Write a protein that binds this DNA or RNA. Structure first.
Lengths: 95, 340, 554, 95, 554, 340
DNA sequence: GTCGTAGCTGAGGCCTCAGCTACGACTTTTTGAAT
DNA sequence: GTCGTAGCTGAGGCCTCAGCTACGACTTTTTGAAT
């Protein structure tokens, strides 16, 4: 069972920002100007929180990780006003 | 009497307490004083300031601080938790169950309303050129109806007679326009007071009546009175039954007079109205021009409640309300109504 | 005559839904919002609040697309403001907007809205139009559901007009619906009190669990004597010595209490007034100086009944008997359940319980208000004489109660000051709750009006003194909220430091938001909600709707 | 019963941004550089979504509203890496 | 002699937990991660991976705070890497970090970790230290839980050393735990296969539902003949004609398939290698050219058993009989359940079913591999002769099957090409799955090795041809995935347009990720998981652990 | 033989197929050719390029393309799905069960290891000043042990004799240092090969042995051989039992020789070690300096497998592995081991 | 389709605050859910 | 404690991308959960 995580950050050093944008494209897909949506099971959430405890500087950065739900029932939990919202789908890439 | 309301017009103002005095300052510079001996409600306009010590001194003396917007829109009161006014409220409620209380004040209100109507006839009659005076047969008729209202037997008879006399006044209301029939501003003698206004003149009349009712409501609530428990009108359904009861003498002076002002000064014209299948309603620019006109009529000074000191209308309302509470509880018999 | 205004057709819609609902909403104002009323207003506002084309007086051939059209006929006796009117030339048709999905009923429209549409149809027919139909345009799916003005639909409409007229002229509020599923969402269930009135009026059922309150916040307490509360748009920033101490969201604030010399900028006062958020000014020690009002409360039947019954002796006598008997019973119960002795004292002495119960019953058989006040005094004297028995397992350092020091102006004990503060700060809660239900908090049946102490809050707080005030004092002392250091002496007596006042006020707030179970109806209800429920039940009792007031003895 | 909502926006016009920062301080408390946490019951969530459908321009802005949970059990659902995370508490303001 | 290396003390920790677990992790490599192993590594890494102070050789008086200290004694027979060593001068004490809360057991430490700490304590005693104690420092609550080296604790430790030595020298993997609660989280439950081996080894139980797979992704298919797959850090961007067509997250990718002339930048290849993500090169038509390997698979017992049994005739014969009997049974079942006739043809002709079942049984009684191949050919001939019976209710336009055109190089039918593509693209799946379990996909018992077709994937795919390949072809044609326009002729034969190849590959993927229910164990398992489970069961059967291989006949 | 591995050192390189030829280009400019007739594994270093057509042509001819990092770190192979090598694997597994196969190759490996050890004695003996030659009694002793290894009866006897002879070689290993005892770099004759290194010289020896084992593993897997199924050592527990079997002759040439190189060139000094209660381990800077040294020893050219053409060591490994697979399946009897 | 990609610099776009100057909203009665 | 606050302008701080130039990681064997 996988969950849908929403990750939003404030990073106060451009190098650390590059490092974190690096890592986050490693894990989820871009959603908003500083927000990523990640569809992860347990192993990968452990990996993500491991990565973002060494990418960031705990003194002045801020990363927020929200566990919306079981990733099958997230659509009632998210309401988007501008663009459409479409959760990450677990299917192969055929192209 | 005891004292008079203090109106702090200056939005700049800063009000402090000086011992037994209430001091108005402008820019750390003094303006005027009240001194709490002859004071009544303290009316603060938009973003004026009242120091909390001054507020507490007002409350301890049970003075109804009232807050108006910058323009003069009412926004709320501030009453004290003392028996100053609950005596007035309990007297009103205990005495509203009486037949002469209701009947007597109703007779006085109606005779005053009729007298104001006929005085406004003799004031503003504009059948100019050939009929400089109103038909004295009409004046004798309204005098007779006034006596009838003096000696009405019961409330329903008074209501019927009131409706009659007001109708025969409105028969010549259009006689009071800029000199003739106001083609483009037609007045219906019979479709009076139906909820949607079917005539432009009737639209003005209804809007002025509503604003006058609001003014009377806030004035009545300023004193310790329940505006929603009337002596003559009927109480429930959300109708302010005491504002409606007491605005009757003041209908010609503030509502009819305001409409006549704004129609003989060209402020309101046929282009200001929109008509729809039986409704004539004002346009926004016209609505607030008329609101300004209603203000201007509420700003005039008249001198004689019973003591001649040229109050503005908006304070004459409070003087009348205080006179009412003072009639109740048995200070002054028979509520000396204001008639010009 | 003017015995009845023109029936608004929305009240006609409500009457065929629940006659009591129409009576409440039309003959007494008394409206309140919930999820759905707010949502419906939101739907209607963005489009149909703003006007559109006029219904042409002279109609030959052109599309009629008027919006928010206000008609009325006085032969019929109704007034309406039609959401929209779609008509080709001379065949018009009312269109009413709704909020939700198409309902799951035959014809897709419930009985009420069909009646509303037929009434608007008759009104259009009155002004010279040919309607013979209407529609319901559900905004959510914009699935226009036609309605045809069948004949007995018009029969229903005219019958409902007559029925509402008669039930308004009678002056008796119709009974609630019988255990209906309509009630749990009628947005006045907090005012109708359906199950409670059913149960007490002896149409006996088991009251279903509280349809919970919704959309109400918590108070704002300003105890600092040098605070400055100013507006910051929708928040309300309280800055002290030019630094932002805290912010309060106006949508989430339900009252404001200004202690002592705390200043409130006039703009903040205006913004509070625009929302009818009560603002109450208090002395530094809790004395209730004044509050804010706004052109009375539109419900008149409540106040008329209150005063007319106030002028009746035995109604006053029965109410006062109930109240102080409840007070003495609660005093006994508190003395029991929180007595803290060591051995042979650890449980209450039955001689005291004998005296207190005998006083309960001597008051229950009181001849007049004079003897009732005498008995209240004697019982309270005994209760306070034993009050010190039961805090911290005995008096601490300085935390000394003197039973003879009660009931007078300057408190010269620490715990006397604490009690007086709690009393004077519960009186405010009761006054606000009583004024929020249409009653007049100053016209009391038992107490006499005097400055700073409204005569009716002082009355209906009598049962609740031991449960809220005394309980808060006891819990505060026992848990260590207050020790002797927290007090400061003065020529007047004893007072509390700011560190003490904030903690004590927080404790009182926790007490007010602390759930209990009603003895009679048996559901979990916070004390703050309980005050409102009791005020409403008093209004019903004075209304003659229920036989007697439920006094909440625990 | 109240829920904890997390609201995050991208606004492409400074006037609309002022309007929305206005409204959002009306409803919740600042959390991150463009994120607010709101503890609302049903009436107030209806109000908020009503306000942010007219503050924003649907063509190019983007507002995201996440319904975390019943506001009593949100703490297991939110993990913050920088600053502390502390949900909005429903209690009076005593100061 | 060198019959056994020094026992790592973590394997000593595992042995007292589950002897089979120690055997798997130590004697055969065979490790896999889950929630908890990853979490524990994350805890240990940030602090104790990096070294610290040395344990002083000459110790007189100074704090010893060494970290990640590697000792071993060969008199004892163990080797350790102690997480930390806290010692004052000459009295040291091992400290082992854990991951979770304090356990809810007497003494706060389970039997395994106590044994690990005692073993490290003995090792410290060996090098001239006085330990007589240890601790468990749970990182989550840093609640250091002391452990005292009681005497029979040392007895347990030495007994476990001897037990592990003997069970490793014996060469027989100990049986799984009996329906334990340890197994559902041992992170090798996907390799131990506890309940399956229990059930088939006739220690018969009812297999508990699949402890589901975790932390594995889906393949990457690169079918475009002009794609360029390059690295973009952790993503893997596939750009075609210099525009980003799609990205693939390397953490979520489990294989890579490069069809035709699709280029893969060397850096992307290196990054795939660093994660052992298999990369498979295929011709444009699906021919399996080559793949990537990395220094073999550390499990040797599996391959040794496979080859040694491969050199045994009747083992090969029994396996081949099972396999093609399963194939014929599945062909019969498919012919039945998806036969689509109109009337008197709408249900299968029993004469064909008679022939197919008689061939099933003639194969079951086969004397040698020659006759088995003959019977397989005859049965497949009949099955394909009737294959066209059952697609789209009959042949469409151009969608013409020729039963004689099978089994040779250039496909000159549309549906022949579709079948050949499906076969050659299932062979890849089987090869990857078989190489991921330690087996050697090229040493087969039935088939002979030849280029592009590994001899063991071709074997163990025989039961699965009708269920996956033929089923995908049928569902693709019936649902309208492929019509005649999708094909393009060529001098060789028939081929598919890119629009056809993408849709067909997507269909095959949907088939592979489509859950079924195992006939024997009865739980919902995807086909891709089923291939791995079957490969593992073959390893067990060759190991002599279970009596016979479960062939998955449905 | 048939052909030789091609090592594409240039990270710049771009490799295409030219019909029957494999063409190396640098900047659209040619470098060299292979032409697939005498080719073996194609080794591509960091970010070299191999066109997919060239890759397919390699796979069709079943040539083990191997990918090394820029430095030379192994990263993976790329083998073809043909029976080219499964024949070699099945021959290895079928023949590992035999007693003379295991025994005979073990005897050859041990005699070669001993011969390399004594040749390294006669090469690098640095008892300089008074003992320019090693004691010929030692040389005769190791010659005798070599004959014994030629005629060992069974595997366990060979293991015991191997351990003996290697010990007596390590007795004079410290004799080969910069001239005397390496105070600060002490060598223990008996604490050999315990898992933690208790001596700095033994730390170097173990690290060199591990790197040599890795090189042999990748070389063996390049050819179609299973490195984990040995003939002489024991298979399980994850030990590469064929790398361990075949690295025995090469221990003196690449491990002992590398340590001697890096200790007689001053590359490794006493300050590079950390000692902890029975463990002497290198420091990071020292670790990768030693890795560079191991490279430098792996880069040297030696000429004589059996055909004299001066291969680098890293390719001599593959030549030996191919010779092994060629001994298996019965091409060349008795696996002509490499001895200097 | 030339090493390919990791890593750094600019230019613009979001996001908020401190510090300034304008200003000076408020509008009849109806409607608004629920099953 | 002077109208108070709504609304607009700057200066800085976050957040990302396009466009450039460096580069050229990979390290023995152990450990790592679970009840």
């Amino acid at each position: 069972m996988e969950h849908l995580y929403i990750v939003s950050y404030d990073i106060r050093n451009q190098r650390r920002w590059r490092r974190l944008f690096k890592t986050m494209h490693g894990f989820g897909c871009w959603l908003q100007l500083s927000v990523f949506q990640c569809r992860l099971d347990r192993i990968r959430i452990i990996k993500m929180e491991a990565a973002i405890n060494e990418i960031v500087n705990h003194a002045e950065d801020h990363v927020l990780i929200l566990d919306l739900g079981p990733a099958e029932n997230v659509k009632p939990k998210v309401s988007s006003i501008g663009k459409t919202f479409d959760p990450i789908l677990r299917q192969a890439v055929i192209v | 009497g005891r004292g008079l309301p203090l109106y702090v017009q200056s939005p700049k103002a800063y009000v402090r307490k000086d011992g037994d005095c209430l001091v108005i300052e402008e820019e750390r510079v003094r303006v005027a004083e009240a001194r709490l001996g002859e004071t009544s409600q303290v009316a603060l306009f938009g973003n004026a300031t009242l120091t909390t010590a001054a507020l507490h001194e007002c409350l301890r003396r049970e003075i109804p601080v009232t807050w108006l917007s910058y323009g003069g829109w009412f926004m709320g009161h501030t009453v004290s938790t003392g028996h100053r006014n609950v005596e007035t409220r309990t007297y009103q409620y205990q005495r509203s169950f009486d037949p002469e209380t209701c009947l007597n004040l109703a007779r006085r209100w109606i005779v005053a309303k009729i007298a104001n109507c006929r005085t406004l006839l003799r004031r503003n009659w504009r059948g100019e050129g050939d009929e400089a005076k109103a038909p004295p047969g009409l004046l004798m008729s309204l005098q007779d109806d006034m006596r009838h209202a003096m000696r009405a037997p019961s409330l329903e008879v008074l209501l019927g007679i009131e409706g009659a006399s007001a109708g025969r006044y409105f028969q010549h209301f259009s006689r009071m326009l800029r000199g003739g029939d106001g083609e483009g501003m037609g007045f219906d003698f019979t479709t009076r007071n139906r909820r949607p206004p079917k005539d432009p003149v009737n639209a003005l009349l209804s809007f002025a009546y509503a604003m006058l009712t609001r003014e009377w409501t806030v004035a009545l609530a300023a004193v310790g009175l329940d505006p929603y428990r009337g002596f003559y009108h009927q109480p429930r359904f959300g109708r302010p039954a005491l504002a409606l009861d007491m605005m009757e003498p003041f209908r010609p002076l503030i509502a009819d007079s305001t409409v006549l002002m704004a129609i003989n000064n060209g402020e309101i014209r046929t282009g200001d109205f929109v008509r729809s299948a039986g409704g004539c309603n004002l346009t926004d620019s016209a609505r607030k021009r008329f609101i300004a006109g209603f203000e201007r009529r509420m700003e005039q000074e008249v001198t004689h409640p019973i003591f001649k000191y040229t109050i503005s209308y908006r304070r004459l309302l409070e003087v009348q309300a205080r006179l009412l509470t003072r009639y109740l509880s048995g200070e002054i018999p028979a509520y000396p109504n204001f008639v010009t | 005559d003017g015995s009845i205004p023109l029936i608004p057709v929305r009240m006609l819609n409500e009457h065929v839904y629940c006659p009591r609902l129409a009576y409440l909403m039309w003959v007494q104002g008394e409206f309140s919002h919930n999820e759905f009323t707010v949502d419906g207003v939101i739907r209607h506002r963005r489009v149909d609040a703003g006007g559109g084309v006029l219904p042409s007086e002279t109609q030959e051939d052109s599309r009629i697309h008027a919006r928010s059209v206000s008609l009325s006929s006085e032969r019929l006796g109704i007034t309406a403001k039609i959401d929209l009117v779609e008509g080709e030339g001379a065949y018009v048709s009312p269109v009413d907007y709704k909020r939700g999905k198409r309902p799951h009923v035959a014809g897709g429209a419930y009985e009420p809205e069909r009646v509303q549409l037929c009434a608007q149809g008759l009104l259009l027919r009155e002004h010279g139009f040919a309607s013979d139909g209407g529609a319901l345009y559900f905004v959510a799916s914009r699935e226009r559901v036609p309605v045809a003005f069948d004949d007995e639909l018009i029969g229903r409409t005219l019958a409902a007009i007559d029925e509402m007229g008669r039930t308004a002229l009678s002056g008796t509020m119709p009974p609630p619906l019988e255990d209906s599923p309509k009630c749990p969402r009628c947005s006045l269930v907090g005012i109708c009190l359906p199950d409670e009135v059913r149960f007490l009026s002896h149409l006996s059922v088991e009251p279903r669990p509280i349809i919970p309150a919704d959309g109400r916040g918590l108070p704002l307490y300003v105890q600092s004597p040098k605070a400055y509360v100013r507006k910051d748009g929708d928040c309300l920033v309280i800055e002290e010595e030019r630094v932002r101490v805290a912010e309060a969201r106006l949508g989430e604030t339900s009252q404001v209490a200004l202690f002592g010399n705390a200043t409130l900028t006039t703009a903040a006062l205006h913004e509070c007034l625009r929302r009818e958020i009560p603002v109450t000014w208090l002395s530094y020690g809790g004395w209730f100086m004044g509050h804010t009002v706004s052109t009375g409360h539109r419900n008149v039947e409540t106040r008329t009944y209150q005063y007319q019954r106030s002028f009746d002796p035995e109604t006053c006598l029965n109410l006062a008997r109930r109240w102080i008997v409840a007070k003495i019973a609660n005093c006994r119960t508190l003395l029991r359940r929180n007595w803290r002795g060591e051995g042979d004292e650890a449980k209450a002495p039955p001689g005291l319980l004998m005296s207190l119960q005998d006083d309960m019953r001597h008051a229950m058989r009181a001849p007049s208000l004079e003897v009732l006040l005498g008995i209240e005094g004697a019982s309270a004297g005994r209760y306070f004489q034993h009050f010190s028995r039961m805090l911290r397992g005995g008096d601490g350092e300085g935390m000394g109660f003197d039973f003879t020091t009660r009931n007078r102006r300057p408190p010269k004990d620490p715990v006397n000051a604490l009690l007086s503060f709690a009393y004077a700060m519960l009186t405010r809660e009761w006054t606000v709750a009583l004024a929020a239900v249409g009653l007049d908090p100053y016209r009391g049946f038992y107490h006499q009006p005097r400055f700073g102490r409204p005569a009716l809050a002082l009355d209906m707080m009598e049962p609740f003194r031991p449960l809220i005030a005394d309980s808060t004092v006891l819990m505060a002392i026992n848990n260590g909220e207050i020790r002797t250091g927290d007090f400061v002496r003065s020529a007047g007596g004893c007072n509390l430091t700011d560190s003490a006042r904030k903690r004590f006020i927080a404790g009182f707030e926790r007490r007010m938001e602390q759930e209990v179970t009603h003895p009679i109806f048996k559901y979990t209800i916070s004390y703050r909600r309980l005050l409102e429920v009791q005020a409403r039940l008093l209004t019903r009792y004075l209304s003659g709707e229920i036989p007697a007031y439920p006094n909440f003895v625990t």
